[PDB]
Write a protein that binds this DNA or RNA. Sequence first.
RNA 1: GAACUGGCGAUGCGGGAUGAACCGAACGUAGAGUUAAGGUGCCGGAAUACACGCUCAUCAGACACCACAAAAGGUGUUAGU
RNA 2: UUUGCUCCACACAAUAUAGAUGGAUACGAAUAAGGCGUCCUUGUGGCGUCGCUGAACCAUAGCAGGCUAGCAACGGUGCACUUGGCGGAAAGGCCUUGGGUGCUUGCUGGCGAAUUGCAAUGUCAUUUUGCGUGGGGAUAAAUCAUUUGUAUACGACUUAGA
Lengths: 106, 109, 136, 171, 197
Amino acid sequence: AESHRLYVKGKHLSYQRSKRVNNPNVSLIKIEGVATPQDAQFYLGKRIAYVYRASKEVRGSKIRVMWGKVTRTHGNSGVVRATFRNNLPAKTFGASVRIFLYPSNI
Amino acid sequence: DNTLLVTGPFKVNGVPLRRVNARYVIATSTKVSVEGVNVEKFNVEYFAKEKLTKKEKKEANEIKTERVEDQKVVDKALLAEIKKTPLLKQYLSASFSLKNGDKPHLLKF
Amino acid sequence: TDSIVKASNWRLVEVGRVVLIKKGQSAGKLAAIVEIIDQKKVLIDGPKAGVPRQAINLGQVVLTPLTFALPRGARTATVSKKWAAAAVCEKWAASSWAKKIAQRERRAALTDFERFQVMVLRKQKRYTVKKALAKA
Amino acid sequence: AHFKEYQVIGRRLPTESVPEPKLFRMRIFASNEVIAKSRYWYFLQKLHKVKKASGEIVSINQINEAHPTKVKNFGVWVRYDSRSGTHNMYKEIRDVSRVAAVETLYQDMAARHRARFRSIHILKVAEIEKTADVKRQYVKQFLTKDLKFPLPHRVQKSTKTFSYKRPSTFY
Amino acid sequence: VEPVVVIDGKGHLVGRLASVVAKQLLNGQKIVVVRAEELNISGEFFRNKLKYHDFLRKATAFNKTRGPFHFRAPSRIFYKALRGMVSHKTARGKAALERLKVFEGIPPPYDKKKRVVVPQALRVLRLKPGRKYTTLGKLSTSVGWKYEDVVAKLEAKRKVSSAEYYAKKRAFTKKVASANATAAESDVAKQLAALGY
RNA sequence: GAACUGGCGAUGCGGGAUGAACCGAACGUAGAGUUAAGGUGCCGGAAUACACGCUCAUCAGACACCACAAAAGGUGUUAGU
RNA sequence: UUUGCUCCACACAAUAUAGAUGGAUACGAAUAAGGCGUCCUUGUGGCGUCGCUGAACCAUAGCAGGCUAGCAACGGUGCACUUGGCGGAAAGGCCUUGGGUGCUUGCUGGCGAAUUGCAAUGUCAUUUUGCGUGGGGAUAAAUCAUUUGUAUACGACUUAGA
């Protein structure tokens, strides 16, 4: 067809933070479509990929991926907490990111 | 090894006899009967990769005949069950993709 | 000539007014207003749909265009009897509001094979409608 | 909180000079048993020469509403402490049960006189059994024959941050 | 959900719209706000004129050129109210603010596009009926904006052209609705009705 | 200038924008969970939550320490005797 | 100034991305009112219907979407042209005429796909520049130095000089 998307779009909002101290080890993700923790409970444990590009070709590609997963819900509005192998570079606040449907329970 | 044996059928969408992981599929509610297929031939030793040595490096750049007539035996038994209810051949030939406005936590498969 | 005003009527709250519970434990059923507590809340009862007789804030219900006869303060046996006599459940079901609700829940209850089927049928219907869009 | 009504019956501790004290009983609106017994001992220390160390509580029982689906008019007599003095007030509330009536009473006093729970004393609450004994216009307004009124200016709260048409406030 | 969101600023409250839009930019949504002369501020016109005069008094004493700049256009007033809610002195704030452009009227890039509203910042949904409000164009031309009438003339011309568009669109959609109704009650129509479409 | 206690001095951490003393809590290096005091329009992590009222200020008001306001008045408005 | 400059087509390199992954899908006004349809005496008109959110509408099947056969219609859509308009607020876009060409999943068939081995973004976008081709297009000024004095601390300014 014309669409081939097998993931859900999301936005990298910020780190986990207090009013004046942030914590880069936990990122905050807005998954689009979900507006409550009860709907966000479907997406727990799903893999997340941040997909970006670079000028230098490394192993056949100019596209590099950072992997992570959803761990828990955050707040009352469907924001989730996500942890990555290496933390997200904080210039990606507001950048798009992919939530895959695996590991599936359905 | 906790894997699922699946087939396309190969005549429909070109997916051969294969094994997949159960955590990487979505079980839809659409059900066909697979009684009449003799799948006890296949096992974990049926799929062997014949592991490659470290010396054989592919600088620049086939199929088992046993595998291809096994596929031809099973898929002709599946498609007879496919022909009963309408539009299943078209459904299995078409691909799945998420459109704009599809919420997977609300979708039923 | 004659004097003309724009009337601008809307959906008075009184006894016998049929309401739809918007949010809460019922959340989508019908009830009948039995009495009016004050400006902001009323005593309702929904005995056919299984809504218990209760006082409720008016922000948690939506008033429907349906009305039937009740005396004020009627108990639930009389409420159910007059509800069945006026037969307002299928009068609600005949409305396009309830048809919209039923369409929404049907589209929610569709599966992937049914979504494929409606895509094929919509392509066929679009073919015949765009064929009709060439003669006028 | 969301109030409940309890009867609390207590007495003095029995002595040899006087066994069987007189078993005083009071009706308390409170959130739970602990607050109910505390308010019971507060009002008995205001009334008689007794305190909690010198007395005991023989019974506490929740009194729920006899007809929780009848719409009543209640007259409530209240003491409250203002910033300069102590005043008596009589307010009447049209509502379906006694605990909800005193909940709206506490909200009404806190809203209109800035009186707190520690300042309000509930003298009594009683159902007005007959109309035309209702003396306040704001509740006598709702007792008229064939009462009906519209609700102008409906505002529907949205779930999306963007709406694709200009909304209507018809009801 | 959208590449660019075009917001019709008419009938909106300035602070509530700015707090919606600033969060949208910080989340990464591109926003363009049109018709900035029709924003509303709650309160009397005289109160908001006094507020702007209190703001207009404030300037650097030894050199007025480096002081706070008092911008007079309605779009720049909205930009001031929004820059107050974005942390504009950082690179993230600058990258957010470059996703925004605010206009008086609807310019020709956006007159053929779709305009949306924000229902939690609309005046008719937020204010009690009876409270007084202002129009940002009237306040701005009271405090020194020079282009209130040319925007009105351009908006009149644009509305004439848009009504000419809408008449043709309405005629076409009535033809399409007529054909859909006549091509309904066939077998595919009843199957789609059973399946929910 | 004294009395009892707790502190700062000798002490970082979360909150009070900011601050020696206030509130919370005292500190090896890390991970996960839960909270205190304080907050949840945006800056800013978190409900433009729910519920009942009150107030429209041609100097509104917005939180302890704390960064001020009184006597006297007002058919402004609300509730009472 | 030893063949330089610009534009057009693709050919290869480099360069990055504040962050495509079906579609930014166009009345205006009011909100104690409207929208749409229809009728008439065309109005601040009569009658009917709708809202109660976009949970919509359009699009959406095919090797990341192939190679072929037929049926039914004379539709739908893409590409390069082509005729006629309209658009100056930041127009740089919108509509339309005609023919060509490709596809059509509206309907019914035939062949292909495996081995990426049980997942690894599994690579499909647009931004700038350079260097090659081969096809057009055009053949300047400014500054220093000299001079002026309507100018001037010096710069700067205003003049003149084939």
